Amino acid sequence: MYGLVNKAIQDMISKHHGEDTWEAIKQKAGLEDIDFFVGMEAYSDDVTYHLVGAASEVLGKPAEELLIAFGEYWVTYTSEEGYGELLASAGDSLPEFMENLDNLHARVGLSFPQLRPPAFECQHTSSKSMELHYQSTRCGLAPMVLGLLHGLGKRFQTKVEVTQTAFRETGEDHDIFSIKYED
Numbered sequence: 392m393y394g395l396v397n398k399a400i401q402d403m404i405s406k407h408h409g410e411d412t413w414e415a416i417k418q419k420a421g422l423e424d425i426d427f428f429v430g431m432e433a434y435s436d437d438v439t440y441h442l443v444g445a446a447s448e449v450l451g452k453p454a455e456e457l458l459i460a461f462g463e464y465w466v467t468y469t470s471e472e473g474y475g476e477l478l479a480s481a482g483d484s485l486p487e488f489m490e491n492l493d494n495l496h497a498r499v500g501l502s503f504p505q506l507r508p509p510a511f512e513c514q515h516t517s518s519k520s521m522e523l524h525y526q527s528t529r530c531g532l533a534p535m536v537l538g539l540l541h542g543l544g545k546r547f548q549t550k551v552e553v554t555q556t557a558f559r560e561t562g563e564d565h566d567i568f569s570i571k572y573e574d
């Protein structure tokens with residue numbers, strides 16, 4: 392993934408746990424040779440997976456729990472590190488934002504030519520609920536989607552309840568989430 396993602400991981404870990412913990416995690420991930428991440432440069436996805444696994448080991452937390460935390464963090468991180476207007480352009484409610492997500496990633500994709508973005512499709516079931524179909528070239532990031540939705544909830548001052556109904560890992564075509572939202 393692009394360096395931006397790995398910077399945000401470092402920033403979250405450093406902020407919550409301090410630089411020493413960050414360095415420990417970086418070392419264990421086998422990434423000691425990397426002085427700093429370059430935001431607009433493409434990295435092997437392995438770099439990201441190794442960081443997550445190392446953080447799980449070091450922090451004594453399941454990787455999936457860390458991914459949820461990271462997903463929430465990304466919503467704030469992007470808004471503060473150069474993508475605030477882009478986020479604002481994607482709308483001012485949860486359902487519109489999720490409708491705009493592929494188009495938001497297409498706009499990101501202009502600047503990041505090699506982007507492999509997720510694909511999100513909404514099926515609105517009522518004015519307070521929807522099914523979200525998440526499709527990806529990558530394994531294991533459904534929990535991040537969970538954190539992202541909660542971050543979007545805080546963003547739009549909207550209560551959200553998210554339940555995964557289909558799992559790409561457990562022999563299903565793709566991840567599907569049931570979302571209830573009020574506001």
Ligand code: HEM
Pocket residue numbers: 392393395396466469470474475477478492496499503505506507508509526527528529532535536539540
């Ligand atoms: C302006 C805000 C955002 C920017 C700049 C951004 C950019 C990116 C970038 C660079 C990646 C890595 C993909 C790659 O390197 O190939 C990524 C991945 C991802 N993004 Fe976004 N993103 C933004 C907002 C969001 C939001 C609000 C969501 C909420 C669902 C989201 C969902 C995801 C997911 C689930 C991935 C994992 C990659 C995958 O599933 O294959 N992003 N994004």
Ligand code: NA
Pocket residue numbers: 510511512524525526
């Ligand atoms: Na989709």
